[PDB]
């Protein structure tokens, strides 16, 4: 089986989110929306921290930009501390894995064997017109 040697493709848009898997991005989104609502509920059991302002605080804390206000209660502070730890680890992971992507590059053959080539069918594969390598498949 003869295929063209795989070279690096043109980097598509929305490539900036390659260093983290899709599942991690979805979990990040819903973790942010869960932390904000929990911080709201906590600050409204016992400080403003309404939903609109709690979402801003959580988003500010994730993007490493300084927070406007800080929780004063205890239960409002546990949430802040946990979300700070989480965002620190996630940003460090993203930066490190992106550095790995840029440093050493791995190229994988799109197709490995003929069984997978039949399964794919996205790549068109052709023989010579008439001959043993052609009459064999018939």
């Amino acid at each position: 089986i003869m295929i063209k040697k795989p070279q690096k493709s043109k980097p598509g848009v929305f490539s900036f989110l390659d260093p983290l898997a899709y599942e991690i991005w979805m979990c990040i989104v819903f973790a942010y929306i869960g932390v904000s609502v929990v911080l709201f509920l906590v600050s409204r059991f016992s400080n403003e921290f309404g939903i609109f302002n709690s979402l801003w605080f959580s988003l500010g804390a994730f993007m490493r930009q300084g927070c406007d206000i800080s929780p004063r209660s205890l239960s409002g502070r546990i949430v802040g501390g946990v979300w700070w730890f989480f965002t620190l680890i996630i940003i460090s992971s993203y930066t490190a894995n992106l550095a790995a992507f840029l440093t050493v590059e791995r190229m994988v053959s799109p197709i490995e064997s003929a069984e997978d080539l039949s399964k794919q069918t996205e790549i068109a594969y052709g023989t010579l017109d008439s001959g043993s390598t052609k009459e064999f498949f018939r």
Binding site: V42, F45, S73, S75
Partner: protein, 51 residues
């Protein structure tokens, strides 16, 4: 060789995992976060039942 293989041909087709961080690498921080929210909601009720 194949049609009677004891180990079988499970995942016989080539499977090349991507180089992106999977959720299995950083699952610990998600466990910690969900536990932290659970604890915060325990404390935020103990305070209110206190008053």
């Amino acid at each position: 060789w194949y049609d009677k293989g004891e180990c079988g041909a499970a995942a016989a087709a080539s499977k090349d995992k991507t180089s992106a961080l999977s959720l299995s690498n950083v699952a610990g921080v998600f466990y910690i976060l969900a536990g932290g929210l659970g604890l915060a909601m325990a404390v935020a009720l103990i305070e209110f039942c206190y008053k």
